[PDB]
Amino acid sequence: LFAGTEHRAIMVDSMLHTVYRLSRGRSLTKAQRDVIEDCLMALCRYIRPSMLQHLLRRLVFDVPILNEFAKMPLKLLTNHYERCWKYYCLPTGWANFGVTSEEELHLTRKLFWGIFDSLAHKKYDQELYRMAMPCLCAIAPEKLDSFINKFAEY
Amino acid sequence: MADQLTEEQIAEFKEAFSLFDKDGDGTITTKALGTVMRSLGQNPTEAELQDMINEVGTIDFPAFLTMMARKMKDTDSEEEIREAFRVFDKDGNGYISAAALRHVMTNLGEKLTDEEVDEMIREAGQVNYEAFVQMMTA
Amino acid sequence: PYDTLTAKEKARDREKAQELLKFLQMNGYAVTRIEKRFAFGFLQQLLRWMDISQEFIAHLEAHEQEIKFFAKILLPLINQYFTNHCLYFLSNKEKEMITSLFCKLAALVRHVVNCLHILARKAGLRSFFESASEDIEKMVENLRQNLTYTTVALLPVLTTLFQHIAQHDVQVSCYRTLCSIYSLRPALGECLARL
Amino acid sequence: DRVRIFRAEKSYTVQSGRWYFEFEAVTTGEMRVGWARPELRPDVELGADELAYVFNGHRGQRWHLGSEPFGRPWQSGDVVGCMIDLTENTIIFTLNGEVLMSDSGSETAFREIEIGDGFLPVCSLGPGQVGHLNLGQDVSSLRFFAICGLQEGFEPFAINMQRPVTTWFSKSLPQFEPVPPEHPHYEVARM
Amino acid sequence: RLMADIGGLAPHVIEITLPMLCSYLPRWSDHLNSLLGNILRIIVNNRLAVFAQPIVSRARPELLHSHFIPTIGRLRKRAGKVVAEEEQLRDEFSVLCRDLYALYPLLIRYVDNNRAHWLTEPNANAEELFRMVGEIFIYWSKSHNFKREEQNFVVQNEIVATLKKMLPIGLNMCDQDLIMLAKTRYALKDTDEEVREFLQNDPEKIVRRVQEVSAVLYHLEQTEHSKQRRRAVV
């Protein structure tokens, strides 16, 4: 039901900021964070891809580090890419939603920067590689002081 | 309930709780309870331990067993589902044969009806090995 | 962090900083030190990955993270790519880079069966293609871990024949291989004759 | 100027049975052939709305609420067939006696199309495009009706009509028309 | 040349000749027609890979069409013999019929690939041959006992080729009261067109074919047609 929130896009953007922050709480239990992550994935599935970019701005900073619990965000990103690959890549996009601008394009460029970062970030790990390969696969002078005074004067 | 969760571990739990309580009156501190849990082998994080203690310094043997049962109930649910996939027949992979379903149902022990078998098949002719079992597991 | 933040995130403040430089110019004292570009650089990264794969093959001819994803994810990563961008490469600098990568792929494999499809789809590239044709002729002569390599090449031979059919120094080697096939799994021979 | 859409009179609306006509694509161009709902807005580009079902032969595409790449491009002097069975709720497109196929290879051009108010022949002529439209007034006039459709039970559109069927074209000349009460963009209130 | 050797070769020889046929197809006429005739003769004399890659299509073979009609008749005779053996009184006959139809469907598909050119011609004795072939295919299809093995063989070999071939020949096979007469015959199970006054109120063979088509249409219509205890069962 969250999808179609274009009339009040502010609410969708706000919840997106809060859910990801709450997912990485310092004091948490396994089920408590698991249900929050499932809620975030379900909300992100049925959303407009263009409106997700505001939270994706922080998501594309968090993803390349992959320091803690990156597997669930990696799977969520894989799902979002599988949902909107033809929308974000092809010039026509998808019919109902308007074609995304270059903002999402450079966001995907930063995502591929993260792909560089995580390609050789850590050593071998069976679970890590097994659960991280779908995201990589589905990614596609005094005078100067006087000038300063002049700037201040301006 | 409590008897149906675990039976053999009661001796180890009683020995650990008796060793933890120096006074012997049956009261164990929260830090002592965590130390006893670590000595048992669970080694659970203190974040869940505090919540379990609050839900259940003055922790006694019955309260300790209630908390241990609450903590240990979760793992058996995950452990039980795995065996059911291959329990139906030797050919666990792609277990869509009617013979495997008949063996699972006619000898289930709960007297599941043939109509109940059809309902389970249609619960969601080919059905994946895990697709119908996940719907049944809920 | 701002550096992490995009120019749009910088917004007016970045412009204001630019304005400050302009103000310095007015003072007379001043301090002086892509979407399609992303698409082109993405094939540039494909060429870089081809070079990395050549280095990895050379090392394997003689565990680490590099070897780890070379064994595990590099082939699936490039596979999912070339599945999504099969005709994107074909429709050029990107085409030349892809051709060089494909030419070096045969040598890297020589040093999985699914990697044959990846291998299926400029002086150095031409030399590599000529060397691959000569190696194919040598394997054909040998036929007239060796068996597995021969079978993998025969499957790659069928893939190359399919590519040549789709198209419609290596010519001499192809003629020699055709003559050997005529002199000596008949579907592979039929595909070679059609190519 | 704009695409000069042609359609038959509303009185000739057919709501049951299977009917067919043949259109001669003398000159290749932006041209579409098929059926449409009785209420068709002359301004909308054909196939953008849910009113019509056609096939663009210049690009080898079929159009209904959008564009689909089904069908093969035609050539000059090619006869395009029009298949529809309201009883079977199915529509097919034919080209010089060859049944067209979609990406999946299904013969049907459009499926699960409700009968609605009815359907009538419709065709659009783009700039520089000239064709000859036959509604099957004479049975022998149809070139490819015997090859396909004759054995399938389909019938020519003007099989029994004793007079030529009147068609309605769209006049590019603008004329004043009253404001629609439910106009999507502009509304007026009498104060 | 190679075509002469292929014609004179009438199973490594067949496999080797298949590469020669593929080479002739990409190189290319009269030689193509001769190769198609030789392939038809080899198929009549005699393995799904043999029918694989049928690039060459005979536009006007004439003689090969007649041979395929005799080939269709031979396949129909074999299928009818298998069906009679099965209906006499075990599963070996059905298994043999399925094995034979595994290769026969390849020939049926090969015929149906170029059947469009024959369908261009309105009337011929090929129409009667196609009617007989459709009758044989309907005899196989309506036999659900034979279908129990035919579907298994098709799945193992890897929505019916015979049904699709019969459907393309439906236009070539064809008053409207013949349909009602066919329905009455199906309800009464009368093979011959005994009720001529019904039509009055050559053509007899057409009525029998209409009855067979009505049976095929009936077959096609038939083809077209707890949480509380969850813990306990788990």
Side-chain angles (χ1 to χ4, degrees), chain A residues 1 3-4 9-10 14 16-20 22-25 28-29 31-33 35-36 39 41-43 46-47 49-52 54 56 60-61 64 70-71 73 78-81 84-85 87 91 93-95 97-101 105-106 108 112-114 116 118-120 124 129 132-135 137-138 140-141 152, chain B residues 1-2 5-6 10-11 16-17 24 26 32 34 41 44 47 57 61-65 69 84 92 94 98-100 109 124-125 131 138, chain C residues 1 7 11 17 28 30 39 41-42 58 62 69 71 73 75-76 81 84-85 89-90 106-107 120 123-124 132 139 149 153 156 166 186-187 189 193, chain D residues 2-8 10-17 19-21 23-29 31 33-38 40-44 46-48 51-58 60-67 69 71 73 76-77 79-81 83-84 86 89-90 92-97 99-100 102 105 108-110 115-116 118-128 130-136 142-150 153-154 156-158 160 162-170 172-176 178-181 183-186 188-191, chain E residues 4 7-8 10-11 19 26 37 49 52 54 59 61 70 73 79-80 84 102 105 116 122 124 126 134 146 161 168 170 182 187 203 215 226 229 232-234:
Chain A
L1 190 40
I10 162 63
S14 19
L16 287 170
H17 308 144
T18 306
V19 292
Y20 188 83
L22 285 176
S23 70
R24 296 171 62 251
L28 280 182
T29 79
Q32 271 177 348
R33 73 161 62 92
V35 57
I36 290 297
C39 176
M41 293 155 187
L43 183 63
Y46 309 91
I47 204 156
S50 57
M51 293 180 183
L52 176 59
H54 203 243
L56 192 59
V60 72
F61 306 151
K71 299 292 180 68
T78 306
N79 287 121
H80 154 266
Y81 283 49
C84 299
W85 56 281
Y87 172 95
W94 284 19
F97 289 163
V99 181
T100 186
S101 175
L105 294 172
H106 89 273
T108 53
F112 206 56
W113 268 29
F116 312 151
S118 61
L119 188 62
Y124 167 67
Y129 292 165
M133 42 77 68
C135 171
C137 291
Chain B
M1 295 298 102
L5 294 174
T6 177
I10 193 66
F17 191 87
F61 193 79
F64 169 59
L65 276 296
Chain C
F42 183 75
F69 64 91
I73 309 171
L75 280 73
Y81 185 22
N84 275 284
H85 285 52
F89 286 168
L90 267 55
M139 295 298 102
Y149 181 87
Chain D
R2 296 173 177 267
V3 285
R4 194 174 285 174
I5 192 65
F6 290 1
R7 75 171 171 86
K10 287 188 174 182
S11 67
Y12 292 84
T13 298
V14 55
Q15 216 165 0
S16 296
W19 302 81
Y20 154 76
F21 64 92
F23 186 33
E24 182 65 26
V26 176
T27 306
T28 314
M31 294 177 70
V33 166
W35 319 105
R37 292 296 173 86
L40 192 145
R41 296 210 43 117
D43 60 351
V44 63
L46 188 153
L51 309 168
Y53 309 75
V54 298
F55 166 78
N56 197 330
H58 208 189
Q61 283 212 302
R62 63 157 194 218
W63 296 65
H64 165 56
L65 293 174
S67 183
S76 179
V79 182
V80 59
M83 272 305 88
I84 184 174
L86 277 296
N89 312 297
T90 310
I92 298 89
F93 288 148
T94 310
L95 188 153
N96 298 42
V99 178
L100 277 296
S102 62
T108 187
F110 300 99
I115 300 193
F119 288 94
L120 73 165
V122 65
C123 72
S124 65
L125 289 192
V130 167
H132 157 280
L133 182 56
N134 195 353
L135 273 185
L142 291 174
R143 290 182 177 89
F144 278 103
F145 179 51
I147 297 89
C148 312
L150 191 143
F154 286 75
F157 192 74
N160 280 137
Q162 59 179 356
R163 282 172 283 113
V165 188
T166 69
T167 61
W168 277 66
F169 79 85
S170 294
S172 66
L173 197 151
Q175 287 180 353
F176 281 117
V179 65
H183 189 269
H185 307 172
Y186 306 130
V188 298
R190 312 173 45 92
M191 181 46 48
Chain E
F146 165 77
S226 297
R229 300 180 72 185
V233 301
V234 163

